[PDB]
Amino acid sequence: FGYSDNHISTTKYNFATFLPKFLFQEFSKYANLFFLCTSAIQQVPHVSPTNRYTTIGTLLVVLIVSAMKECIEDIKRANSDKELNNSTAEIFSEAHDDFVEKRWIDIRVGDIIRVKSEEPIPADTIILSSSEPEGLCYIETANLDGETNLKIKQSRVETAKFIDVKTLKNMNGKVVSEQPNSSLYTYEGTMTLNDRQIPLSPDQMILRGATLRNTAWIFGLVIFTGHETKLLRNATATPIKRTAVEKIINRQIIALFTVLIVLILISSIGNVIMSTADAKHLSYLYLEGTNKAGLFFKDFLTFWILFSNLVPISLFVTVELIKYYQAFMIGSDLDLYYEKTDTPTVVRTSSLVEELGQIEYIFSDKTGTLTRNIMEFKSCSIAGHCYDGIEVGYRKFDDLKKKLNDPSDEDSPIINDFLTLLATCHTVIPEFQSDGSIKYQAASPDEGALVQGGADLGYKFIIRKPNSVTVLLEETGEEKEYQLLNICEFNSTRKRMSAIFRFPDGSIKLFCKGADTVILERLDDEANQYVEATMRHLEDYASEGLRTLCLAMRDISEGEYEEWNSIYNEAATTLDNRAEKLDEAANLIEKNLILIGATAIEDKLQDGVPETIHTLQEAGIKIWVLTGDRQETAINIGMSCRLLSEDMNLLIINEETRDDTERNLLEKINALNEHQLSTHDMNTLALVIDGKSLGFALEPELEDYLLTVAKLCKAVICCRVSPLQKALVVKMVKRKSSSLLLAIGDGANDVSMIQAAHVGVGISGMEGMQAARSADIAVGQFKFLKKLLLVHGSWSYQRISVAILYSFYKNTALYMTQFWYVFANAFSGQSIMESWTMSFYNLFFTVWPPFVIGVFDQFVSSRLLERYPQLYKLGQKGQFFSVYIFWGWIINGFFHSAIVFIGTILIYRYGFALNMHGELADHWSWGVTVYTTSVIIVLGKAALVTNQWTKFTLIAIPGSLLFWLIFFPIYASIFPHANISREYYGVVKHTYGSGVFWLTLIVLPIFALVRDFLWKYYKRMYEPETYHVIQEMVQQFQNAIRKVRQVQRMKKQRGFAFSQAEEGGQEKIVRMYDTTQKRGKYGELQDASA
Amino acid sequence: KKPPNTAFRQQRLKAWQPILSPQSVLPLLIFVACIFTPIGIGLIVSATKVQDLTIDYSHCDTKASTTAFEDIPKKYIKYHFKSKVENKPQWRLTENENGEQSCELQFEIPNDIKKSIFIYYKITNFYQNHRRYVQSFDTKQILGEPIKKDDLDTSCSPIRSREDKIIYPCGLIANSMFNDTFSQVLSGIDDTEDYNLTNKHISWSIDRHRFKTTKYNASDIVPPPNWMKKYPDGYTDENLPDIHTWEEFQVWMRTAAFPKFYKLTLKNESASLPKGKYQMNIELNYPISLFGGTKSFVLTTNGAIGGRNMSLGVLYLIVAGLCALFGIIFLVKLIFQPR
Ligand SMILES: *[C@@H]1O[C@H](CO)[C@@H](O[C@@H]2O[C@H](CO)[C@@H](O)[C@H](O)[C@H]2NC(C)=O)[C@H](O)[C@H]1NC(C)=O
């Protein structure tokens, strides 16, 4: 009664999980805990050398701005969740009987819905009725599971009579359903109709993430909804993913906290030594308090506040604005824009953007991500001929031309039976459209490719009748009438299918297609006549990643089909095991075939996929394929997308219950004990795992043992993997031997695999859409990961590296004068600058130069960064951003603060550095002198660390100097009169009226800029080894690995793949359909013609 | 929808990338050296142009001469005139029960210094930049407001209140102030000049707007305990100090940044100081032993930098040296590297 709604909220927070998840997301970084506690203990009286509310104020501004970026981010994903949630849905209403165009949100449990065809399904529905004979319907679960075939979803016989929209008012009762757990292939339930109990099963269990194909409509009683569904259950929270650059930021905050406690110990022990040694010479302080441990604690807190600004307060905010604004500028690129379905490459989490320069492993989906889910009839090895550049259609004009050579051509009955085999031996359904085109309803895209390819070559397939005729249409002829006698269903232990026919002259003939390892064991072909040329054309097909079948025939006499039809009739009516006895019959009939020829279809990859995978493997990235589809399909796709090259060994591992260590121990004993050069042995070796062979091999007795020596492969193609074990692979690789991972998928079989990654990319566009909305980056097409990753991650990591190291520099370049003055104040804790001017330093006047370093600069152009994918390996090793280089920047801030300090000591000696009538520059005139000098050394350094100068760098690098030189008389001339900074009375007249203030600002920064200007000259005129070295950069072990069990060479591959399941429908479908007779009065009603 | 093809949005902004050829960096270094050499010469010359005279008179009472004009030891005198000083500065210590160890200092100005002359007291090792020190003054109370008890600034804490009364100039700065009253005259001996000086226009112009005469009636307040010798009976309506007028209080309240500082007392900006022998009479009220360093008076005639400080003058020449030392390294290296 308290069931969920149908919203897929991929929001990072909803209403009440904002404040704990955002405050935990902010205080997981140490430079906000540190200012929470140096805000809290700054409230202790007579301790704060700055003010009570400085760190309160700027920490509050940091918290509000980070909550603003968090809020705009979560709104920009909230209207995308709402964009998926306002999708159409036809819902039966109790008031009036018509299905009305509601939204997905208004669907509840127990709600009869109607979905149309080739359009997605909103909820887990029991099929109660359909427009097809006996109420069946098809579905393509390429987002539930990953297989590209279609699935029979039969409705029950007692409920399929509710075809009419008007008559489902008396459909009353209940559904005692399953618990909402996430077993995809499993369902248990008992529907109660008006009188009877109905047993339920996963047969009538259309799930959420898949689309209804090749029907007209269904009627679906909604059971599970939203996150209650089987596919989106343990898969939608938008977790806090700590990027790998902010982790090493956190150990740099540990590093600066170490040098902090070194300075507070040096400083406060100096306060003990001077405060007890010269106590007779400090009598003008009245230090009558003899508690030296108490004043050690209080003064410890004074240096703990005064030194507290060495870690930058505007660190995580300015990194969130660089990451957010880079994520804006890469989600708005024409080179990453996919104009076919209008998707502008939106980046959602916006904080995992420098992860894109860190990626070492990519864990891709196959179906939809790598492929277009289309199968085109590419080629046909037909009587031993493909071609003699690549020409394929010229064979087809040589085929229509060679067929019309009927007086003098030996091949003409053979190619006639091959083209008959392409358009008769199948289970596709023809659909007469309204226009002048026919649409083939195919449960196999293999069979749809074969029938559409036979229709593009003469024989157009026209009408199926159930236990009756099966007519075609020739281009030369008019129409030929066949007669489908028997059908042999496809099976994975069978690897073939067959169909006994009756030609219109009365000749009963068999047609059969399948794998050569199964077909070729069962034929003669008159002493292997067409066999060997068929073999070498299978090797020509499998070398290009083409799905391949061996298409053969034989002949049957009248008495052989008489007695055999009898035996198959008593074989089909057995309820013990129909599949096994039909296999035993269906290979007692398939002796001594004649190999007519072979076919070749391609699974039609997404655009730019082999170029992308090739230029990512050049980037040092190891693409693994986590698919839910079959092994042979993914070997043909990895062969077609150039993962599997020529001469690659395919370490197959198809385990059993405890037969795991035989495969792993044999492959690793036979892999490690012999050692080649092992650089060109990486590139000829690949791993193929099952899903049952990986649920047994992802367990801690085999887990590190799998990765740390089976990462010696070039490609790991994990085949037929559930949505759970995909996430187990990603978590398993990011935990043991922690690299930086990327996940890309199209549908919600990958949503657990995308959220469990360091950065999870999703494919937006077509019917696979749920993975893109719950992603870190939604991308239109897989080829945009090449420019999104190599250009927009190498920029996003190097610019953020120089920005973070610069901000550490600038904060220890201002606030380290505070420590050099401890030596001169009395080891007392005297702040040099005014209180709010420091907050203005790390909030107003040095916060934009890191922003324009981190965005508007480039250190490599986008041309040479994608012409040389080798330059991506500069980021994977963490070369630009470490803790050693961090010590270079921090020590640079120490040297610059040291020479600003010592310089202004010697310049403003005695305070006697004014010409204005004998007056003296006080504490605070000197304070804004070292403040301003530190501003000019700091943005001068930001001028030295930008490579290119945009118009926004001229706003931030000199315009922050100009904005302080304009800001300071306004502030120090207005705000002292408002009792806010009363330390600034007369400081404008005694600084900007001073000759030696502007003289100090001229030269005293040019000392520090002499050091960094000459070093920045030297490291690009005589030390060029950042980019240019990278630009200027056997058979016995193979015989050993071929001897290992389950290792398959490339040269023996014949490329068989046939997407058809056992619950996909072969023998039931043909006996039901009519193409001639039209619809009924209610929907596209086809009667049960049986 | 489709993003715009603007140069901003598509990261095609008009960016200038400076190549660091030695046709650009090396004339920059020769130009920066060529422009910071003559200014740094002009800032050593204008810092060696001023003519000061510092006499450490801190050990005038314990060294006591008290009967004649005997010489000051060379540890204590520092003079930087244009001419050389023929007769060394003398010192004595008078005592006549009302002067209370005044230290007559008798120096010889050797040239008529025509720029405006300014008399400071230099105090070494007085940590006036201490954390407990640059606080400890009630800002509303130096404005003249009768700030009562429990409304006073708590930073004045040891020098905040007394025997059921409050201290009007509370805290550490407004206690503990330098009270060696310099005489308003450089008394010329042997009939040279009899040169006058003023304790007016000595502080900042904004201190004379903030430090105002108080609104107490001298029975609610009490003087701070260090200068209780000038007010032995306490505060009366007649002797109560005008903080707006005293103006040597508010040069002390303007706390300096360093332990070694000047503070202004006297000046004369309208006449030259001729080349006579001048007797400056300093009433020693402020002991050494309070702080831990030397008290000295400076007679200086500041310039564009404002004192004899060659630091920024030689500091244009360190930068102008490195822009010429590395402009020869990165040019002899630039020739000999493809040689
Ligand atoms: C000048 O200042 C000194 C110290 O700043 C004063 O000396 C103090 O006088 C009070 C009252 O006589 C004593 O209680 C202190 O112990 C003295 N401190 C010392 C000697 O270090 C001196 O009285 C002031 N002279 C004046 C105001 O004429």
Ligand SMILES: *[C@@H]1O[C@H](CO)[C@@H](O)[C@H](O)[C@H]1NC(C)=O
């Ligand atoms: C000038 O000096 C003489 C000599 O001490 C003095 O009497 C006179 O008052 C001074 N004039 C002033 C201070 O205006």
Ligand SMILES: *[C@@H]1O[C@H](CO)[C@@H](O)[C@H](O)[C@H]1NC(C)=O
């Ligand atoms: C400066 O000194 C001269 C004597 O050389 C004197 O006449 C004049 O009044 C003094 N000016 C001031 C402002 O004290």
